[PDB]
Amino acid sequence: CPLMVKVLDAVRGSPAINVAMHVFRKAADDTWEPFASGKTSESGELHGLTTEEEFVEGIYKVEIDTKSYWKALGISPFHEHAEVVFTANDSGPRRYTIAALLSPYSYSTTAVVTN
Amino acid sequence: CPLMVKVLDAVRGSPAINVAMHVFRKAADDTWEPFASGKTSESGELHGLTTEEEFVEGIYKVEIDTKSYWKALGISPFHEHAEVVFTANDSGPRRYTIAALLSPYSYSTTAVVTN
Amino acid sequence: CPLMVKVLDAVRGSPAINVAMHVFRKAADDTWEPFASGKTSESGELHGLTTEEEFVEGIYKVEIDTKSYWKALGISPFHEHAEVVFTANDSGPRRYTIAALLSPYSYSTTAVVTN
Amino acid sequence: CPLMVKVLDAVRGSPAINVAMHVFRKAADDTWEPFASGKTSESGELHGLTTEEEFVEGIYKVEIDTKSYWKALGISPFHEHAEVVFTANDSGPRRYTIAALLSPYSYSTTAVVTN
Numbered sequence: 001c002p003l004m005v006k007v008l009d010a011v012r013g014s015p016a017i018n019v020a021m022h023v024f025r026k027a028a029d030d031t032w033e034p035f036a037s038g039k040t041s042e043s044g045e046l047h048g049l050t051t052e053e054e055f056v057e058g059i060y061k062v063e064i065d066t067k068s069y070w071k072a073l074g075i076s077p078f079h080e081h082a083e084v085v086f087t088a089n090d091s092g093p094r095r096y097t098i099a100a101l102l103s104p105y106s107y108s109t110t111a112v113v114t115n
Numbered sequence: 116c117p118l119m120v121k122v123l124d125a126v127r128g129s130p131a132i133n134v135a136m137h138v139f140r141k142a143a144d145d146t147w148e149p150f151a152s153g154k155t156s157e158s159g160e161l162h163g164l165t166t167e168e169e170f171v172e173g174i175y176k177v178e179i180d181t182k183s184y185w186k187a188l189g190i191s192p193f194h195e196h197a198e199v200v201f202t203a204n205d206s207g208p209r210r211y212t213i214a215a216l217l218s219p220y221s222y223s224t225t226a227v228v229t230n
Numbered sequence: 231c232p233l234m235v236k237v238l239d240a241v242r243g244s245p246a247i248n249v250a251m252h253v254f255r256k257a258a259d260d261t262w263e264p265f266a267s268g269k270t271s272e273s274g275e276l277h278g279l280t281t282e283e284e285f286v287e288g289i290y291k292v293e294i295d296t297k298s299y300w301k302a303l304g305i306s307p308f309h310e311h312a313e314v315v316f317t318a319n320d321s322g323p324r325r326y327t328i329a330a331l332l333s334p335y336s337y338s339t340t341a342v343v344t345n
Numbered sequence: 346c347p348l349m350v351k352v353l354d355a356v357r358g359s360p361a362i363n364v365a366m367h368v369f370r371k372a373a374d375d376t377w378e379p380f381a382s383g384k385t386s387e388s389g390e391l392h393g394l395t396t397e398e399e400f401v402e403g404i405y406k407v408e409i410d411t412k413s414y415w416k417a418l419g420i421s422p423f424h425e426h427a428e429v430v431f432t433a434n435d436s437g438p439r440r441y442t443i444a445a446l447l448s449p450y451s452y453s454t455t456a457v458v459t460n
């Protein structure tokens with residue numbers, strides 16, 4: 001698993017479950033080509049998005065549908081979605097975890113890049 | 116001032132100065148149209164992007180060029196940019212402050228909305 | 231103003247108003263002595279805690295009473311308070327802004343230090 | 346494992362390894378009694394701090410020695426340590442993860458409370 005996403009809820013202190021997201025890869029014409037997608041598990045994690053052969057160097061965007069998550073909880077959010085845009089590079093063996101911590105008017109994201 | 120952006124640097128404990136950003140607004144045909152742009156001052160703030168008359172209801176995206184900021188400090192960061200996407204003025208005019216805290220592998224963003 | 235504190239609410243997208251806090255300074259005998267206290271204004275800011283003459287080198291602790299803030303909004307939060315402990319003025323006088331972003335199960339704090 | 350701590354480094358995009366921390370429980374005389382301690386693993390995690398029988402309701406403090414971590418990396422930090430103070434409550438079966446994300450002048454902490 002070269003790319004994993006984990007989402008947590010800062011209002012409830014819990015994994016953010018059933019959060020939909022799409023991953024895009026940037027095309028040579030500067031458009032966003034759909035690449036992978038899924039919904040987070042009961043642990044707030046989404047695995048199996050891609051494979052090592054497919055996950056080549058380039059620019060990727062992860063669009064997390066935070067608005068639908070808050071609306072299902074009855075909470076009015078600020079953001080339409082949370083977007084994480086990054087370059088994947090080949091500097092030795094690398095696995096990427098994108099983590100996002102969600103509040104109604106705020107989010108934080110970090111990347112854990114390990115061997 | 117209906118739309119202000121503030122950016123801080125979590126490595127140096129200082130405002131993030133000279134950070135470029137571009138604001139876009141979603142058009143009727145669902146494309147992103149250029150709306151405003153500028154760069155942060157010595158206080159880390161960008162004022163004067165728009166006016167109350169021009170800042171109509173819509174979906175706006177603030178694209179903060181964090182990669183260029185970190186590169187000039189000698190750091191190769193994870194993200195290409197920080198994106199903040201939100202619906203503005205859906206219940207009438209509001210004033211928005213978009214704040215971003217930057218680290219090389221992480222950022223946080225929040226919004227302060229006042230009537 | 232050599233020491234200012236700003237507090238924001240990530241659930242409401244607003245300044246966190248009427249948040250009490252206490253500042254302590256570590257004495258020679260290694261105990262925490264009361265130094266200053268106050269509560270945030272309608273802008274979420276607390277100014278005037280100390281003066282340049284009184285704010286000598288030392289280890290300071292800012293204890294932000296986040297639990298009382300959330301309780302008044304009907305929320306049972308995780309943390310008892312947010313603590314920020316730092317050495318101040320070790321290289322000569324500085325001005326410090328301590329900022330905190332609050333959610334029920336999470337907070338973030340940063341510091342802006344200027345000469 | 347009723348209480349786990351995870352620490353990440355926002356400058357390097359990696360687990361924060363070998364971070365020392367102490368856990369205290371508040372005494373009836375309002376002093377902090379040492380309870381448990383350890384250092385984070387190569388995954389940035391510290392497990393085995395306590396057992397279910399020992400981890401009774403009360404107020405706990407986790408003091409994370411972030412200053413020594415940054416000094417070992419050659420980076421000048423703001424905080425003396427990161428302190429997380431919380432009430433443990435018996436509302437059904439509950440396991441607590443305290444997570445902290447570290448930058449030199451900023452940190453964020455959240456709690457993941459699961460069944």
Ligand SMILES: CCc1oc2cccc(I)c2c1C(=O)c1cc(I)c(O)c(I)c1
Binds near residue numbers: 214216338
């Ligand atoms: C870019 C500013 C900023 O972005 C953040 C994102 C997440 C958490 C936090 I805390 C912050 C934060 C602040 O610390 C801050 C906000 C304002 I409004 C200020 O006026 C000042 I001084 C400081």
Ligand SMILES: CCc1oc2cccc(I)c2c1C(=O)c1cc(I)c(O)c(I)c1
Binds near residue numbers: 099100108444
């Ligand atoms: C120390 C970990 C951590 O602390 C934070 C504080 C604020 C915001 C964030 I996003 C984080 C964060 C994570 O990124 C994270 C959390 C867990 I729980 C994980 O399992 C993994 I993988 C990654």
